[PDB]
Every structure is written in C-alpha cells, then in structure tokens.
Amino acid sequence: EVRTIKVFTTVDNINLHTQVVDMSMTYGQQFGPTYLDGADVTKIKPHNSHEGKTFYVLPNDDTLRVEAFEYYHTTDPSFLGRYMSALNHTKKWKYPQVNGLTSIKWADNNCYLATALLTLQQIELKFNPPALQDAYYRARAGEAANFCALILAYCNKTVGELGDVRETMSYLFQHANLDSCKRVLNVVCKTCGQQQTTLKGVEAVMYMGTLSYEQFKKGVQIPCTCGKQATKYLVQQESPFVMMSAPPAQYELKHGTFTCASEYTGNYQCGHYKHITSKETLYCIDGALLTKSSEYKGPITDVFYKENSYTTTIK
Ligand SMILES: [Zn+2]
C-alpha cells in the first residue's frame, strides 16, 4: 500500500519465504494464522521492528506442505498451531541442570515431561523427524523449550494438562528408530499348551503388567481363554533398553539393578511424578529438586533397564 515491510514466512524455521506486507492490514488478513516465536500475531498489524523477521504460518500450498512433512513427519492440519501455542509457554519455563542432566522446574503440571526428558538422556535412542533431532540436541545442551513444545504437540497435550509417562514415551518411541529391536515371548497353559509370539519395534521394548525385568524372565501370570491362568515368559530380547510398566504400586528399587524409574503419587485425575536414577547412589530428581538415599521405596509406575542381547535358559 502506501506502506510495506519485508518479512519472511516459514514452517520449519530453516527454509524462508520472502513476503512484502501492508502495514495497514493484519497478518491474518494477509497470511492466515501467523506466529512470531510462538506468539499469535494473526490479529496484529505489522510493526517497524518486524522488518526482516521470520514468522511461522500454516501449510497452505504444495511447497509448504512438503517442507512441513519433511521436517515434522505429520500432516495433522492443527499441528503447527498446537506447537506454536505450547512454545509460547515452554519458552518461559526454566531448565536447570540437575546431577548433570537437563530437567524442568515445575510449572503447569509438567512433572510427567520432566521425568520423560530425564529418562531420554539415560537411554540410547535416536529420533527420525528432523524437528525432534534438532530440538533434542538443543535440550541436551540445556535449551529444551522447543523440544518440550514438540512433545506436547506430538502427544496432543496442551500446557497444563496432566499426562501419563508411559503414553508419552510410546509416542516418542513411535518417532524413533527402533527397527532393530526384537522380542520373543512364550505363553504356557496347562490346558491349551504353549504359544510363541514375536514383537518388533516399539512393542519389543515396552511391557505393561510388571515392573521387574527378572520376573518377566521367570514368568508372569496372565489370563488364558480357557479360564485358567497361563504363564508368559521372555524367550529372547534384542534392544539397547527395555521399559517395564504397571499401575502404581509400592515397589522397592535396589541400587545397581535398574537404570531409572518413574514414581506417581495421586489418582486418575491429579497427581505428581518424580524421577529416580541409579548412579553412584540413588538420586530422586523432582523437577529442580534433588535428594539422595541408599534405598528407595514408593509408588513406581515405570522402570527402565539396560539391555543388549538376552536368551532364556528355560526349556
Ligand atoms: Zn488355557
């Protein structure tokens, strides 16, 4: 018009698209929903200080659609808006270093995110979407705002919502390279005989029902269709870690027998997670808080163990 500035739009913050905007019009009148480092500027008109800056927009043509899928590995139409909305909050959280790991100072029911982030830094895992690769690298260095906002977006959780650690890891593992992970199980009924099953990928590293990896190797009792109880035991395992999960229950963690774990106090509606890690002693990381002990007992819901290759001796 009488008057313009130059700005750049983007969906990945790497590839930029030159634009000239009229300063008498809102960004939304010109681009649609528009964001400046997480802040929604759809209803704002351009300012002088905006010249030369980068704005996120939604994918609304073939070029941006391809750029967004290549970077994020999703075509959910609401993804970028949910990422930007979370980022406006996570960029204000604090990310203290606790016993050498990036944690999160408690805010907005984010305890489940803190213990997931602490867990990731203790297990061997590589992400596939460039967005997660780039953000996780930054989080390890201590600037985890983009990583947490992406976790929230991928998991369809909003800031303030209470999440579940097992479900959060399941979403993150879907976006990780676990192709070389393999699990063989055997289920034995005294009436119906035995049945072997093989699992791959995410399903090879996650089990729901018991926290103890040793008990899983000895055998755990599960329902059979004939009405009896059958025994399920681990036959073979190829993976760099395993995750055992169960509904929260009093459980004793022994120094040196596990990598890390999550503890949950509360009920179906509200609660609080803490993280326990086994190093030179047992450390309990609770957001920005840190305590130590030689023994630990509490309502544990997930335990992670190191692994490489295991073969049963059970015949
Ligand atoms: Zn049976």
XYZ file of C-alpha atoms and ligand atoms in Angstrom:
316
model
C 0.000 0.000 0.000
C 1.156 3.453 0.960
C 3.340 1.279 3.049
C 5.110 -2.079 3.454
C 7.845 -4.029 5.203
C 9.713 -7.160 4.150
C 9.264 -10.256 6.349
C 9.890 -13.987 5.890
C 7.414 -16.823 6.434
C 8.346 -20.412 7.278
C 7.065 -23.725 8.572
C 10.425 -25.168 9.734
C 12.468 -22.041 10.638
C 15.123 -23.060 8.094
C 13.652 -22.513 4.611
C 12.463 -18.896 4.372
C 9.911 -17.341 2.003
C 10.179 -13.631 1.146
C 6.997 -11.576 1.649
C 6.008 -7.914 1.472
C 3.233 -6.973 3.906
C 0.941 -3.941 4.093
C 1.194 -2.287 7.488
C -2.485 -1.229 7.450
C -3.602 -4.896 7.379
C -3.309 -7.619 10.000
C -1.044 -10.592 9.415
C -4.145 -12.774 9.418
C -5.668 -10.705 6.617
C -2.533 -11.429 4.570
C -1.143 -14.852 5.631
C -3.812 -16.562 7.743
C -2.849 -17.678 11.267
C 0.637 -16.242 11.924
C 3.095 -16.618 14.809
C 6.247 -14.801 15.949
C 8.394 -17.092 18.133
C 5.212 -18.716 19.487
C 3.173 -15.525 19.953
C -0.021 -15.425 17.883
C 0.105 -12.260 15.738
C -2.857 -13.064 13.465
C -4.771 -10.056 14.845
C -1.735 -7.692 14.960
C -0.755 -5.269 12.220
C 2.928 -5.159 11.167
C 5.335 -3.086 13.273
C 8.537 -1.375 12.181
C 10.577 -3.731 14.372
C 9.143 -6.711 12.413
C 11.101 -5.943 9.248
C 13.404 -8.836 8.373
C 11.945 -11.201 10.985
C 10.673 -14.758 10.476
C 7.024 -15.709 11.057
C 5.518 -19.199 11.218
C 2.443 -19.799 9.057
C 0.276 -22.855 8.379
C 0.997 -25.070 5.331
C -1.380 -23.812 2.617
C 0.357 -24.724 -0.636
C 2.371 -27.586 -2.027
C 5.784 -26.109 -1.212
C 4.993 -25.550 2.483
C 3.125 -28.849 2.779
C 6.238 -30.729 1.640
C 8.544 -28.684 3.867
C 6.325 -29.303 6.917
C 6.038 -33.046 6.370
C 9.768 -33.465 5.746
C 10.608 -31.598 8.968
C 7.873 -32.871 11.375
C 6.665 -36.187 9.820
C 2.993 -35.293 10.383
C 0.204 -33.933 8.175
C -2.159 -33.125 11.069
C -3.653 -29.759 9.992
C -3.675 -28.399 13.552
C -0.084 -29.438 14.393
C 1.731 -26.138 13.846
C -0.871 -24.170 15.780
C -0.599 -26.570 18.710
C 3.226 -26.460 18.609
C 3.241 -22.650 18.495
C 0.688 -22.419 21.356
C 2.771 -24.700 23.581
C 6.014 -22.886 22.684
C 4.619 -19.573 23.960
C 4.534 -21.272 27.385
C 7.599 -23.528 27.346
C 9.937 -20.736 26.338
C 9.187 -19.286 29.825
C 9.844 -22.489 31.782
C 13.242 -22.993 33.471
C 15.550 -25.911 32.607
C 18.066 -26.403 35.433
C 20.923 -28.879 35.219
C 20.361 -31.499 37.964
C 23.118 -34.073 38.549
C 24.375 -33.445 35.039
C 21.019 -33.798 33.217
C 18.588 -31.252 31.802
C 15.471 -31.155 33.985
C 12.437 -28.832 34.116
C 11.421 -26.605 37.013
C 7.837 -27.461 37.928
C 5.052 -25.482 36.203
C 1.740 -26.217 34.505
C 1.547 -29.915 35.534
C 4.783 -30.611 33.617
C 6.192 -33.269 36.016
C 5.492 -36.045 33.505
C 7.507 -34.138 30.901
C 10.453 -33.645 33.261
C 10.735 -37.332 34.022
C 10.357 -38.270 30.350
C 13.123 -35.801 29.412
C 15.409 -37.130 32.160
C 14.760 -40.716 31.009
C 15.625 -39.970 27.379
C 19.031 -38.664 28.480
C 19.830 -42.051 30.067
C 18.797 -44.451 27.265
C 20.106 -44.961 23.738
C 17.582 -43.568 21.249
C 17.701 -41.590 18.001
C 14.720 -39.682 16.580
C 13.608 -39.761 12.926
C 11.872 -36.346 12.353
C 14.483 -33.622 11.859
C 12.375 -31.425 14.138
C 12.947 -33.835 17.054
C 16.609 -34.433 16.176
C 17.314 -30.684 16.178
C 15.267 -29.872 19.279
C 16.573 -32.823 21.313
C 20.150 -31.749 20.580
C 19.294 -28.291 21.955
C 17.555 -29.801 25.031
C 20.622 -31.889 25.915
C 22.605 -28.636 25.909
C 20.031 -27.074 28.263
C 17.668 -25.141 25.945
C 14.711 -27.534 25.948
C 11.796 -25.163 25.216
C 11.316 -26.286 21.601
C 11.699 -29.991 22.490
C 9.021 -29.807 25.212
C 6.652 -27.845 22.954
C 7.108 -30.527 20.277
C 6.444 -33.336 22.777
C 3.202 -31.578 23.727
C 2.227 -31.167 20.069
C 3.049 -34.761 19.035
C 1.154 -36.143 22.072
C -1.887 -33.857 21.569
C -1.499 -32.491 25.104
C -1.903 -28.807 25.958
C 0.126 -26.916 28.544
C -1.473 -27.567 31.920
C -2.960 -30.988 31.057
C -1.792 -33.939 33.187
C -0.164 -36.596 31.008
C 0.908 -40.220 31.512
C 4.634 -41.066 31.252
C 4.097 -44.482 29.602
C 1.861 -42.952 26.905
C 4.296 -40.086 26.364
C 7.240 -42.480 25.813
C 5.060 -44.550 23.491
C 4.513 -41.505 21.249
C 8.209 -40.582 21.326
C 9.266 -44.181 20.548
C 6.956 -44.182 17.505
C 9.091 -41.318 16.133
C 12.394 -43.073 16.934
C 14.434 -45.641 15.026
C 13.723 -48.902 16.861
C 13.741 -51.060 13.728
C 16.469 -53.383 15.046
C 14.542 -54.223 18.258
C 13.134 -57.760 18.601
C 11.314 -59.673 21.361
C 10.250 -63.335 21.529
C 7.728 -64.423 24.181
C 6.231 -67.785 25.152
C 2.827 -68.317 26.805
C 2.178 -71.678 28.509
C -1.248 -73.026 29.528
C -1.530 -76.308 31.390
C -4.731 -76.991 29.375
C -4.051 -75.384 25.973
C -0.262 -75.883 25.673
C 2.253 -73.200 24.600
C 2.224 -70.351 22.086
C 5.210 -68.286 20.944
C 4.925 -64.711 19.682
C 7.413 -62.273 18.159
C 7.237 -58.494 18.528
C 9.200 -55.750 16.740
C 9.964 -52.077 17.168
C 8.195 -50.167 19.933
C 6.268 -53.277 21.005
C 9.570 -55.098 21.537
C 10.789 -52.619 24.198
C 7.575 -51.898 26.190
C 5.644 -54.245 28.509
C 2.612 -53.439 30.690
C 1.853 -55.552 33.768
C 5.042 -55.939 35.831
C 7.922 -53.635 36.818
C 10.505 -56.389 37.334
C 12.632 -57.436 34.345
C 13.812 -60.525 36.261
C 10.248 -61.632 36.987
C 9.442 -61.177 33.257
C 12.288 -63.601 32.527
C 10.986 -66.123 35.107
C 7.343 -65.803 34.096
C 4.265 -63.749 34.944
C 0.681 -64.947 35.251
C -1.952 -63.800 32.750
C -5.484 -64.906 31.821
C -5.996 -67.716 29.321
C -9.072 -68.030 27.156
C -9.913 -71.413 28.705
C -10.394 -69.651 32.074
C -7.157 -70.808 33.708
C -4.103 -68.639 34.334
C -1.218 -69.069 31.882
C 2.476 -68.193 32.279
C 4.170 -65.675 29.940
C 7.959 -65.505 29.903
C 10.656 -63.791 27.896
C 12.459 -66.045 25.404
C 14.743 -63.616 23.527
C 15.460 -59.863 23.571
C 17.474 -57.649 21.179
C 17.338 -53.968 22.195
C 19.518 -51.324 23.895
C 16.988 -50.849 26.718
C 13.622 -52.143 27.898
C 10.743 -50.362 29.668
C 8.575 -52.234 32.211
C 5.354 -50.537 33.327
C 2.479 -51.242 35.706
C -0.302 -49.416 37.578
C 1.284 -47.541 40.505
C 2.116 -49.729 43.485
C 4.570 -49.751 46.374
C 7.814 -51.115 44.959
C 11.414 -51.233 46.189
C 14.202 -50.000 43.876
C 17.637 -51.578 44.532
C 20.783 -49.621 43.718
C 22.535 -51.085 40.681
C 19.604 -53.224 39.456
C 17.989 -50.715 37.039
C 18.741 -47.553 35.046
C 15.969 -45.153 36.034
C 12.318 -45.134 37.005
C 9.194 -43.022 37.400
C 7.083 -42.674 40.562
C 3.491 -41.396 40.658
C 1.510 -40.101 43.651
C -2.160 -39.273 43.108
C -5.194 -40.704 41.322
C -6.856 -40.768 37.886
C -7.447 -37.004 37.956
C -4.467 -35.291 39.565
C -1.075 -36.365 40.797
C 2.664 -35.850 40.628
C 5.569 -37.757 39.049
C 9.133 -37.993 40.357
C 12.204 -39.494 38.677
C 14.651 -41.933 40.352
C 18.056 -42.626 38.770
C 20.618 -45.245 39.881
C 24.174 -43.873 39.713
C 26.808 -43.896 42.491
C 23.784 -43.859 44.824
C 20.020 -43.410 44.290
C 19.044 -39.861 43.277
C 15.453 -38.629 43.277
C 15.040 -35.765 40.813
C 11.781 -33.852 41.293
C 11.914 -31.092 38.706
C 14.510 -28.656 40.099
C 14.718 -30.561 43.422
C 17.267 -33.279 44.274
C 17.538 -35.748 47.172
C 19.547 -38.946 47.649
C 19.202 -42.229 49.542
C 20.749 -45.684 49.711
C 17.388 -47.461 49.380
C 14.123 -46.374 47.767
C 10.505 -47.455 48.153
C 7.452 -45.827 46.606
C 4.584 -45.997 44.079
C 6.607 -46.855 40.968
C 4.923 -46.952 37.545
C 7.820 -47.386 35.082
C 11.338 -48.822 35.265
C 13.988 -48.748 32.519
C 16.787 -51.338 32.237
C 19.875 -51.627 30.041
C 19.996 -54.440 27.522
C 21.875 -55.725 24.507
C 21.085 -59.396 23.813
C 19.317 -61.950 26.038
C 18.411 -65.624 25.542
C 16.389 -67.669 28.027
C 17.649 -70.895 29.554
C 14.079 -72.098 30.215
C 13.391 -75.130 28.015
Zn -5.851 -72.376 28.571
